[PDB]
Write an enzyme that holds these catalytic residues in place. Sequence first.
Site, mmCIF file in Angstrom:
data_model
loop_
_atom_site.group_PDB
_atom_site.id
_atom_site.type_symbol
_atom_site.label_atom_id
_atom_site.label_comp_id
_atom_site.label_asym_id
_atom_site.label_seq_id
_atom_site.Cartn_x
_atom_site.Cartn_y
_atom_site.Cartn_z
ATOM 1 N N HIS A 1 5.357 -35.213 41.402
ATOM 2 C CA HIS A 1 5.136 -36.549 40.842
ATOM 3 C C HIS A 1 4.098 -36.468 39.732
ATOM 4 O O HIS A 1 3.644 -35.384 39.378
ATOM 5 C CB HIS A 1 4.691 -37.547 41.930
ATOM 6 N N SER B 1 2.623 -32.667 45.257
ATOM 7 C CA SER B 1 1.720 -32.801 44.123
ATOM 8 C C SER B 1 1.252 -31.428 43.581
ATOM 9 O O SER B 1 2.066 -30.544 43.326
ATOM 10 C CB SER B 1 0.525 -33.677 44.537
ATOM 11 N N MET B 2 -0.048 -31.246 43.401
ATOM 12 C CA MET B 2 -0.547 -29.987 42.864
ATOM 13 C C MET B 2 -0.175 -28.794 43.757
ATOM 14 O O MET B 2 -0.148 -27.645 43.301
ATOM 15 C CB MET B 2 -2.069 -30.063 42.647
ATOM 16 N N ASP C 1 7.369 -40.530 43.087
ATOM 17 C CA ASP C 1 7.434 -39.497 44.119
ATOM 18 C C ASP C 1 8.858 -38.985 44.296
ATOM 19 O O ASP C 1 9.763 -39.734 44.679
ATOM 20 C CB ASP C 1 6.915 -40.025 45.450
ATOM 21 N N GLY D 1 -4.071 -32.551 45.678
ATOM 22 C CA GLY D 1 -5.464 -32.939 45.534
ATOM 23 C C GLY D 1 -5.933 -33.032 44.090
ATOM 24 O O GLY D 1 -5.207 -33.478 43.216
#
Lengths: 6, 6, 6, 6, 6, 6, 6, 6, 6, 6, 6, 6, 6, 174, 174, 174, 174, 174, 174, 174, 174, 174, 174, 174
Positions: free
Chosen positions: V105, V80-81, V154, V51
């Site tokens: 990523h 991600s995060m 990714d 997010g």
Amino acid sequence: FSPXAP
Amino acid sequence: FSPXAP
Amino acid sequence: FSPXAP
Amino acid sequence: FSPXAP
Amino acid sequence: FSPXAP
Amino acid sequence: FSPXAP
Amino acid sequence: FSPXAP
Amino acid sequence: FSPXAP
Amino acid sequence: FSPXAP
Amino acid sequence: FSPXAP
Amino acid sequence: FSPXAP
Amino acid sequence: FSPXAP
Amino acid sequence: FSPXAP
Amino acid sequence: DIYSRLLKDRIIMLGSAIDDNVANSIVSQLLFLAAEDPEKEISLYINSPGGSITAGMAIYDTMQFIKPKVSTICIGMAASMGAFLLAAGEKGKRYALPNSEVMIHQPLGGAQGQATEIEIAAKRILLLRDKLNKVLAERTGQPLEVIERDTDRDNFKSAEEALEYGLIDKILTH
Amino acid sequence: DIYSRLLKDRIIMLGSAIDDNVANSIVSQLLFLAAEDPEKEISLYINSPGGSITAGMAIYDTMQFIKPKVSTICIGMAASMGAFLLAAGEKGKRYALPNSEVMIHQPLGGAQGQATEIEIAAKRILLLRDKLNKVLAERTGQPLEVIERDTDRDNFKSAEEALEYGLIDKILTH
Amino acid sequence: DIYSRLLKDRIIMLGSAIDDNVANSIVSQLLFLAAEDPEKEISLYINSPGGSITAGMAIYDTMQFIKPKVSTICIGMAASMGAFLLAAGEKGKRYALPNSEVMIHQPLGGAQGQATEIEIAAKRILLLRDKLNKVLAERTGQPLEVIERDTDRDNFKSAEEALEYGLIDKILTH
Amino acid sequence: DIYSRLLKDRIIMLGSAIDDNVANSIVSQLLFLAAEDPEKEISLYINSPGGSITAGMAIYDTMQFIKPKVSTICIGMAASMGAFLLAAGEKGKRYALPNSEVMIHQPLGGAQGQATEIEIAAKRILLLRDKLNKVLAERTGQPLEVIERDTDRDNFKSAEEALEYGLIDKILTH
Amino acid sequence: DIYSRLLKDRIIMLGSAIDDNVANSIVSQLLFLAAEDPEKEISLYINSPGGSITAGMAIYDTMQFIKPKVSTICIGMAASMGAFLLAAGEKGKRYALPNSEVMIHQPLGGAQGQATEIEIAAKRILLLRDKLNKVLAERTGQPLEVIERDTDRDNFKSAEEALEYGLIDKILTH
Amino acid sequence: DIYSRLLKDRIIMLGSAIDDNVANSIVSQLLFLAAEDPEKEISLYINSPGGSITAGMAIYDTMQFIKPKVSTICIGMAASMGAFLLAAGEKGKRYALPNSEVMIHQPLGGAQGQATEIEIAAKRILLLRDKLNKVLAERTGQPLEVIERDTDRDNFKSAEEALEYGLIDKILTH
Amino acid sequence: DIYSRLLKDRIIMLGSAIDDNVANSIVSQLLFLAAEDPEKEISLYINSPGGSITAGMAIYDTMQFIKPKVSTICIGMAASMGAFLLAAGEKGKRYALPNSEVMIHQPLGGAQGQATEIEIAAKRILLLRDKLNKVLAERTGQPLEVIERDTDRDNFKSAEEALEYGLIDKILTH
Amino acid sequence: DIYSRLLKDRIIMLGSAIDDNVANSIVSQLLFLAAEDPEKEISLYINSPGGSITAGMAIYDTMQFIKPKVSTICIGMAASMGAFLLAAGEKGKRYALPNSEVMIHQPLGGAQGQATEIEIAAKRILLLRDKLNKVLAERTGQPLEVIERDTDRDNFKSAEEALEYGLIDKILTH
Amino acid sequence: DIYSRLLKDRIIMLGSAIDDNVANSIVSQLLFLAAEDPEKEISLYINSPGGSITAGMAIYDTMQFIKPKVSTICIGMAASMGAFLLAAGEKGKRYALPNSEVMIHQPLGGAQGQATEIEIAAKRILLLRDKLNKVLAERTGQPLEVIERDTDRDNFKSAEEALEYGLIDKILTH
Amino acid sequence: DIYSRLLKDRIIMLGSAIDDNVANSIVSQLLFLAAEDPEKEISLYINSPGGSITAGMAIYDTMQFIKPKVSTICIGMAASMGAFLLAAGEKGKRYALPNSEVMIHQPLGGAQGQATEIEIAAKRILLLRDKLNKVLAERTGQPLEVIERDTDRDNFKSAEEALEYGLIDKILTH
Amino acid sequence: DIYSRLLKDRIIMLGSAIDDNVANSIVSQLLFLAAEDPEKEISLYINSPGGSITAGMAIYDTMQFIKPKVSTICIGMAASMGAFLLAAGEKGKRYALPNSEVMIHQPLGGAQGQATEIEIAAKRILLLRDKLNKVLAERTGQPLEVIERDTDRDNFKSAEEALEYGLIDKILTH
């Protein structure tokens, strides 16, 4: 999620 | 579309 | 549309 | 598209 | 629309 | 777009 | 729109 | 828009 | 809805 | 809504 | 809103 | 988030 | 928001 | 225009769903061609999914009215009122191509509002189903009971099957 | 244009819902044809679901004004004001094809806002229903009470039924 | 074009709501016809629901400016500014067909924003109602008080009623 | 085309909101007519609600550049930049019809984003209001202070009032 | 067509936002006119808010390629790439009308997705800003640092200001 | 038509995204021009953002099939398949204007549904990327590994950079 | 909750259109109250526009099944199935307030699809109209022919009129 | 809850448009309070724009049925049926605040469909206007003709004016 | 609540995309648990797609600030995060289940408007990519160059692969 | 609830646009607090953009009716009717924070329909503007003519300026 | 509730955009906490993108009014008015976490309508930009000219950079 998380 | 229509 | 209209 | 179609 | 308009 | 295209 | 414009 | 463009 | 269901 | 409903 | 309603 | 806020 | 409101 | 060229040789193309516009155009063309020569037959090429019942009947009634014999050729698909029109061609001159598809079924409609209004609509469409089925019966040779049964649900037929059913008279090959 | 060709032979096609545009066109054509020859009759082919009341009356009033006798042919469907126009054709020259459909009913409308405004609309449409019913009665031969009753709800009629009712004079066959 | 043909015979058709486009066209045609022959009268056929007040007055002012006398014929419906224009026809040459409908009422508008802005709009439309009512009074012969009262709400009139009111001079029949 | 006919007689019609398209067309026509005959005056008929300021000035600047004198006629409504253009007509040759309406006001615009950006927009429109007001003052004879005050809010004027104000020179009657 | 008439006299009108379509048309016209007579100058009239950068450069590159000298006239508004094109006119032959408006600013764009993709877009637009500013500097005579500063935000200029800045060479008056 | 004029001089304009319609038109024109004179070269002006891969290859394959040598000119922007087509021009006759922009990147696509279906799509687009990259390599002189690397993400190039890369052979100036 | 309080005193409120949810709630409450005391009567307050026929009958059937007598009070409006339910109250214990409104009419529905399907829907709703009309007849004392006639169209009744018709037994006053 | 607190002291708040939900709630509260103590008066505070006619009458009828005297206080605005309810308060106990606004007017509604259906709707709303006007007349002391005239259009009244009219009995001050 | 139960045993669940709300909640819980016992470790269970970057860093910074060691468990997916947070767990106490998936990523974002504004956004996201990559490098042991390369697109990793990369320390089995 | 806590200490928060709901709540709270202790003053905290005029007057009228003195504090922004309410606070007890903003202007509204209806709306809003302006004049000490002038357009004031104008009596600092 | 727990320990969470609701809540909490103990400091945790200017000032003014010293902690992101509030914390007690982000810029707004209205809006926002910048200058130590320059466009700062600028006093680590 123990042994060991807790 | 002849023979026969025309 | 004749006979008779025309 | 000739030679040969036409 | 004549007689009389024209 | 000439000289030279045409 | 004459007399007078034209 | 002449004189002078054309 | 009794008598008889219950 | 009484007298008389109740 | 009294005096007087209530 | 203390020491020191609280 | 006192002194003085309350 | 390619179609205008076909019209010059007495060929009308019904290649779109049938609505009042299409219907009026076909009708006009039929009357036009009949006016130019009440002797030379006319060819109605069909590739339509069908459409309005009143629109189709306008076409049908005109096909019957004019003196020229109207032959019909099913190219691609002839469904619903399009199939009806194909069957309406001059007996002996109703054709279909090898892989043409012909589908016959019952009328589709709708009713909204009061029971009385729904009943008005119901009677109309039920009356139309009968009027159409009766003509189909005459045109095919199939008894009415058979037409009623076979059109209860979408009934897709190959050219070979359309021939056996009496919808067409001949399959164009080469 | 196929229609322009029909106009050359004094045939006007009313084959769409009736709105001010359609109405103005039909009116112009009627006046035009009447101007070219106030003797030769004119043929109004009808295949319309109806439309605006004031638009239909514009056509109706013009049919009456011109000298040429206007014959009407119902091809496909003649509903609402279209049926009214069909019935308005020159007595003795009102036709329909074998499978034509003729539907007569009462006017449709709407009212929004204050009671007073709704009342204004109510009186107008009720007045229009009477004006129309009266003409229908004259044109058909049916007494007003009969027209009022028979148009209370959508009344669909076959060409045979339209003939018996007095809406048309003859069914075109072959 | 059918309308272009009518223009050749000095007939202008106002058969759509009145907007600046329609207004400019009618105005141009009036000036054009007046230019070709300032003697032969011009005929403005009307079948409009009305429209912009400034657009109608553009037409009205032009009708007054040119030398040719402009006769008006209400075919179908003449409502709002359309009715105003009908009443504006050359006295003695204002017609309507048997089933024409004529409706007169007060101006319609809107105001949004600050009280001051709403007041600006209010004064404008109220002034316009007066200017229009005064001309109607002159054209009909009815006293202003009567026009003001009779146009408070939508006032639908038959051709017979329009004649009795002084909106038209004669009903075209046959 | 009716308008193309007016152009043949040196009459340009500005009868729609003013946008770059309209502006470029008017400008081209003005340059065209001036090219054909730099002596014969040109007539700009106006019935517009106004529009883009830069579009109007394009027209205005062209009116001034060409040798032919441009007379303006307000037919219907001349609001905002349309009124400005009316006032811009050749002194002594600015007309309006009896019931024409002329409205003058201040420029309308918008600003979004950062204070700095809003300020950019603000200075521009305020500058434009001044440039316009100054020309109006010169064209009318009214002092700037008067124009500034009278255009603060929508100011609707009758032809008589437009004449008294100095926006037009004469009212066309008969 | 009024514009086709202007083209006959070597005048191209850029009076709409600049997109690939507009750009291709202008480019074709320029090449066309240059083909007909590589000696007679061409006039590009501008009243555009600007548009695509690659579209404007297509026009710009063509202006430079052809032998005929291209003069530019700002009528109305010349903003963004439109202003750039105005400045691109043959030195000494760049005009504007008294109330024309000229606005110069930096390129506008967008970037969506991964940081790497945003960086690709960033470098491109920043590169374009430089390429454009450098040409502006050459065309105006202003140093690059000045162009960079003055185009940071929307910079609206009067014709007098555009002249002082070096964007145009002369203001057309009478 | 301005473009039809360019066609008369053997110039085809690809100035819109490439879709089947655009592709079929270009192909037809190429075959047409080749038919008229298989000797005179043809010029393909490009200002396109690219489009369908199969559409571009249709154009490409035709460029190769015909005898006439096809020269390409990048005017404005030549991105994606448009850049591919630019590079496809006859070796030695591939041009670009001073401020033209050329962008090369990898194919774009989509896959929905079952893993098996996604795999079908994946293999296709990956195969297409290779087929295109290989041709680019041959046309530019750059080794395949270099093309694969440089097209991994949107790669924008100036005319000077396009020349250094081998996408074009000369920059048109004056 | 105010309603939960009314339930404590054996009062159920039907004050919304009737849908399956409302119906199931009312039914449950009726069975609940009947379970707590099969002797004490229950009061069903009605202010509903009506709704689903099967939903209303669920309520109706439950009113009949349970031993406690169900009295009905029309407060506000009792239309369609709501009016039916009002009439269904225990004979002698059906009330309405002075300005209550009671409206009875025929069922509303819809049919889409094949003639056969439309017929299925038609027979169902026509059957429902009869079933409902018969009960109304029994509950009011009016002969079936009268109910059939009076429910042909929306029939609005005042409390005085509802009483005279036999829909209610008494009007609550003070 | 603040309102639940007011209910504890026999105060019902009608401060939203009146719909069946609001109406049922108010009615329940009135019956509830009357049940707890048929002696202590109840206060209905009103600040509503009005709403459904049948909903308002449900409230009205209940206000009349219960023994407790219901006093009404207009706070803010009392328009349409809200005003009606204000006027319905116990004679002598109808109040309004210094700057309260009271607006009376005629019922609003709509009708769609067949002339017969529009007529049904027309008679209903016209009947409702009468029923309401009659009660207003009784409650104010104004003759029916006066109520009918004064409610023809939105009639806004100050508290002073409401008092003079007979809508309220006293203005609360301090 | 099941989660509230986990919180009682020092377990925080990050099982949704990370937005400011989620972030503030996690942060509060972390501070809360740390307040109750700055000794007992805390467990952060992760199953998130990632997010907001600033939201994740709020969580990250809090994980570092508090004394208790925070262990992380990847259950399901950590992208991600979310993956960043997993890697942020106390060294030696970062777990994942057998079939967990971990994806790393580069940041995603957007820029709209002027070149200058796009540049502002570009620098920010590029700076964030660096700040994140550096921490990832420290936490994994991989050199920065490796993180930069491996996060370009990714990068999906199995638990075994996450372990080998240094994102987690142990895979929970049984 | 934080606000319910403030109510316990006689503090009402008007921190949203003013609509009937907000107004009824504030009024109830005022009556409630006055009931609990008609001696202890009440504090109305204001941070509102304004809203409905009748809603604000409901609040105003209540502020005046109750015995307790109502002090007002402008926190944030007090615009339109919110500013009016601020000014309505007990003389000597009207406060604002250092950076509070107070904006006064004229009423906003709309009018649609017939000239007569627009006039109805115009008179109402103009009457309201006066009623409000008069109270403002009394509360501030400014002469009516001054209020009328200063509220012609949005008039934003700092706390210092609000004090000088007489809208507040003191600025809270520390 | 987790937040309610933080409030028990004098911690207010501003973790959402700032609107009147958020602002009123924060203000109430600040007054509440100050009431409970005017000695114990209060902690305002910030993770907000900013919002309404008047809303932020309401918070700011309250921070200043109360006796307790308010410390601020930037967690995540502190942008626009959120950054302003962070800077507003008690000098020496303004913190930020290692990876916090702080962004300062100029106010954002909009203006629609007449030039006069746009000018009203312009002056307001420009005044607000000054009022804010002045406070920022006092709170940071930076001269006003510097604040004005640095906030011209979105200015993102790392915690280290925020510290160097004077926005915060210390970075929380461990």
